[PDB]
Design an enzyme around this catalytic site. Structure first.
Site, mmCIF file in Angstrom:
data_model
loop_
_atom_site.group_PDB
_atom_site.id
_atom_site.type_symbol
_atom_site.label_atom_id
_atom_site.label_comp_id
_atom_site.label_asym_id
_atom_site.label_seq_id
_atom_site.Cartn_x
_atom_site.Cartn_y
_atom_site.Cartn_z
ATOM 1 N N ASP A 1 3.906 2.243 7.698
ATOM 2 C CA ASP A 1 3.054 1.208 7.579
ATOM 3 C C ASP A 1 3.752 -0.057 6.797
ATOM 4 O O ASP A 1 2.937 -1.144 6.466
ATOM 5 C CB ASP A 1 1.715 1.284 6.674
ATOM 6 C CG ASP A 1 0.794 2.300 7.594
ATOM 7 O OD1 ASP A 1 1.038 2.530 8.897
ATOM 8 O OD2 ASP A 1 -0.450 2.725 7.345
ATOM 9 N N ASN B 1 1.560 7.723 2.641
ATOM 10 C CA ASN B 1 2.313 6.951 3.449
ATOM 11 C C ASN B 1 3.822 7.527 3.703
ATOM 12 O O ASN B 1 4.679 6.799 4.146
ATOM 13 C CB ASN B 1 2.264 5.556 3.396
ATOM 14 C CG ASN B 1 1.085 4.862 3.873
ATOM 15 O OD1 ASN B 1 0.317 5.332 4.684
ATOM 16 N ND2 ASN B 1 0.444 3.632 3.148
ATOM 17 N N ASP C 1 0.831 -1.333 0.019
ATOM 18 C CA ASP C 1 0.012 -0.023 -0.126
ATOM 19 C C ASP C 1 0.753 1.256 -0.037
ATOM 20 O O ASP C 1 0.580 2.392 0.499
ATOM 21 C CB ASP C 1 -0.961 0.005 1.149
ATOM 22 C CG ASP C 1 -1.872 -1.157 1.290
ATOM 23 O OD1 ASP C 1 -2.495 -1.540 0.202
ATOM 24 O OD2 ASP C 1 -1.931 -2.018 2.353
ATOM 25 N N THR D 1 -5.935 5.123 -3.110
ATOM 26 C CA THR D 1 -5.415 3.826 -3.052
ATOM 27 C C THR D 1 -5.457 3.085 -4.567
ATOM 28 O O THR D 1 -4.246 2.617 -4.733
ATOM 29 C CB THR D 1 -6.023 2.811 -2.112
ATOM 30 O OG1 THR D 1 -7.449 2.529 -2.372
ATOM 31 C CG2 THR D 1 -6.002 3.348 -0.748
ATOM 32 N N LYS E 1 1.967 4.585 -1.200
ATOM 33 C CA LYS E 1 1.221 5.828 -1.724
ATOM 34 C C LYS E 1 1.641 6.936 -1.135
ATOM 35 O O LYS E 1 2.178 7.036 0.042
ATOM 36 C CB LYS E 1 -0.251 5.629 -1.577
ATOM 37 C CG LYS E 1 -0.873 5.516 0.051
ATOM 38 C CD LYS E 1 -2.209 4.903 0.128
ATOM 39 C CE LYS E 1 -2.638 4.749 1.642
ATOM 40 N NZ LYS E 1 -4.051 4.688 1.892
HETATM 41 N N1 LIG Z 1 4.856 8.246 12.525
HETATM 42 C C1 LIG Z 1 3.926 9.018 12.391
HETATM 43 N N2 LIG Z 1 4.047 10.384 12.828
HETATM 44 C C2 LIG Z 1 2.973 11.042 12.679
HETATM 45 N N3 LIG Z 1 1.909 10.697 12.151
HETATM 46 C C3 LIG Z 1 1.645 9.750 11.727
HETATM 47 C C4 LIG Z 1 2.560 8.743 11.955
HETATM 48 C C5 LIG Z 1 1.778 7.504 11.369
HETATM 49 O O1 LIG Z 1 2.380 6.257 11.220
HETATM 50 C C6 LIG Z 1 2.161 5.288 12.332
HETATM 51 C C7 LIG Z 1 2.074 5.775 13.373
HETATM 52 C C8 LIG Z 1 2.001 4.500 14.472
HETATM 53 C C9 LIG Z 1 2.281 3.421 14.226
HETATM 54 C C10 LIG Z 1 2.316 2.910 12.913
HETATM 55 CL CL1 LIG Z 1 2.387 1.356 12.530
HETATM 56 C C11 LIG Z 1 2.203 4.094 11.896
HETATM 57 N N4 LIG Z 1 0.643 7.675 11.041
HETATM 58 N N5 LIG Z 1 0.421 9.013 11.459
HETATM 59 C C12 LIG Z 1 -0.689 9.747 10.985
HETATM 60 C C13 LIG Z 1 -0.850 10.738 9.817
HETATM 61 C C14 LIG Z 1 -0.592 9.623 8.606
HETATM 62 C C15 LIG Z 1 -0.584 10.686 7.337
HETATM 63 N N6 LIG Z 1 -1.698 11.465 7.338
HETATM 64 C C16 LIG Z 1 -2.080 12.039 8.466
HETATM 65 C C17 LIG Z 1 -2.142 11.148 9.612
#
Ligand SMILES: Nc1ncnc2c1c(Oc1cccc(Cl)c1)nn2CC1CCNCC1
Ligand SMILES: [Ca+2]
Length: 453
Positions: free
Chosen positions: A152, A136, A131, A171, A133
């Site tokens: 992810d 991510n 996935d 997606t 994109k």
């Molecule tokens: N590392 C991050 N730092 C900040 N925001 C994060 C993340 C994230 O990825 C994650 C956050 C926690 C666990 C996992 Cl497996 C993936 N997801 N997000 C949320 C965002 C992802 C992109 N669009 C807006 C919401």
């Protein structure tokens, strides 16, 4: 055995991601900030068994690369998984690209070298993304020289994808054709990167269509062209790399490792290089469209959830109203608000009982008549989705005309997967004398009607 809420406290909401909500959390002892993805077991099906997920998590926690999100911890309770890792504050890559004044093949090559470097490392460790994109691809910090972090990696192996359009926006453009038919391997990430590179250099998806299924039909056929005016200013080595990355049969497709050694990556990350102005303009329009479609679907979703919860919380408090005077004490409102999440499932922002009490205290400061508490408690839940919708409408309306044309409505509702005859019928009931365009209030009225209001 270890409990998530005993170690971490939720501070702020970071946003919705694949398989769950993401919350900014803080270790109660060390003060370490982390991003926590909360996956609801009732909303997300597991593809593998408990031990297979534990073994992958144990491996994922040990892997380390500057373009891959670092994972720190993993928790599991009755109804949730908690994936705890490093927080990145630079936002989504494409949101930073549209803010800058110039963008060249040097900038696109530096982006794709980082993404390919991260993918190469994860493929060497037998982890597939599937996935990949732009959403991510996060920037480590707000600095202009910040690294890209892919989030992810490895989750799609263990959790089933959502079938809801509010979770699937964007997606279809990036998914590899072999993923659609079921036989796939790590080469699917090269294809997805190939699509991203095509959009970085032209601002247009290589496989496009007026709705999700039409995009998937183009992806499945695998045919695309470089017959857009904006491709004339792009180098031939860039087009050769895209051609190798978007090769249909995965065994013939270039590996992530060999895409790094490609002439384009070697030349453009070390000879005239102009700014790809038409590409930036197209990425800005593409990003605005995707964000408005997403904002529209989340607005409709939160409005339906709000209607469900408004009625459930009213029934809970009506039963708790001993004498029927329409009023309840603070202790009773906590009991009923906790009762709401006990039956409707724990909210990501209400991680434990202490978070529930603070939310009740914030509502009691604004407003005891329990009907007033219900109204204010439920308006706070939708606030973010309502302001996200208006902000996304204003961003999409780049000429500040105050209106969106019927052709733009067709594009937005196409990306949102709202049937053409369905939204035109709704528009006729909002404004019987509509003249091919809507302002923000008319657009919002259309969405209210499109979710039973
Ligand atoms: N590392 C991050 N730092 C900040 N925001 C994060 C993340 C994230 O990825 C994650 C956050 C926690 C666990 C996992 Cl497996 C993936 N997801 N997000 C949320 C965002 C992802 C992109 N669009 C807006 C919401
Ligand atoms: Ca406009």
């Amino acid at each position: 055995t270890a409990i998530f809420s005993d170690r971490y406290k939720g501070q702020r909401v970071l946003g919705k991601g694949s398989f769950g909500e993401v919350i900014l959390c803080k270790d109660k002892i060390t003060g370490q900030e982390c991003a926590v993805k909360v996956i609801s077991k009732r909303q997300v099906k597991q593809k593998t068994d408990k031990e297979s997920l534990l073994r992958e998590v144990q491996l994922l926690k040990q892997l380390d690369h500057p373009n891959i999100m670092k994972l720190y911890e993993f928790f599991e309770d009755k109804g949730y998984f908690y994936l705890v890792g490093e927080v990145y504050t630079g936002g989504e890559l494409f949101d930073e690209i549209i803010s800058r004044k110039r963008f060249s093949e040097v900038d696109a090559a530096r982006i794709i070298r980082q993404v390919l470097s991260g993918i190469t490392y994860m493929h060497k460790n037998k982890i597939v993304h599937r996935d990949l994109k732009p959403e991510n691809l996060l920037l480590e910090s707000k600095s202009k020289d910040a690294n890209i972090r892919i989030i992810d990696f490895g989750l799609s192996t263990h959790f089933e994808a959502s079938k809801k359009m509010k979770d699937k926006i964007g997606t279809a453009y990036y998914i590899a054709p072999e993923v659609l038919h079921g036989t796939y391997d790590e080469k699917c990430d090269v294809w997805s990167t190939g699509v991203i590179l095509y959009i970085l250099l032209s601002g247009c998806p290589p496989f496009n269509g007026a709705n999700e299924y039409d995009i998937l039909k183009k992806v499945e056929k695998g045919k695309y062209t470089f017959e857009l005016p904006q491709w004339k200013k792009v180098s031939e080595s860039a087009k050769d790399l895209i051609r190798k990355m978007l090769t249909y049969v995965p065994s013939m497709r270039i590996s992530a490792r060999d895409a790094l050694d490609h002439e384009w990556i070697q030349t453009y990350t070390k000879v005239d290089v102009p700014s790809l102005d038409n590409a930036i303009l197209n990425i800005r329009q593409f990003q605005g469209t995707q964000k408005l479609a997403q904002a529209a679907l989340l607005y409709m979703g939160s409005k339906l959830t709000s209607q469900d919860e408004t009625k459930e919380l009213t029934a809970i408090f009506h039963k708790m109203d001993k004498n029927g005077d329409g009023q309840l004490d603070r202790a009773e409102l906590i009991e009923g608000y906790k009762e709401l999440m006990r039956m409707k499932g724990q909210d990501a922002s209400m991680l434990d009982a202490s978070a529930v009490e603070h939310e009740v205290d914030q509502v009691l400061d604004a407003v005891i008549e329990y009907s007033e508490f219900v109204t204010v408690a439920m308006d706070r839940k939708t606030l973010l989705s309502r302001e996200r919708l208006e902000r996304a409408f204003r961003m999409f309306d780049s000429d500040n005309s105050g209106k969106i044309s019927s052709t733009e409505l067709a594009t937005i509702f196409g990306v949102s997967d709202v049937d053409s005859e369905t939204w035109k019928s709704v528009l006729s009931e909002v404004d019987k004398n509509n003249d091919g365009e809507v302002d923000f209030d008319e657009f919002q009225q259309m969405l209210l009607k499109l979710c039973g209001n």
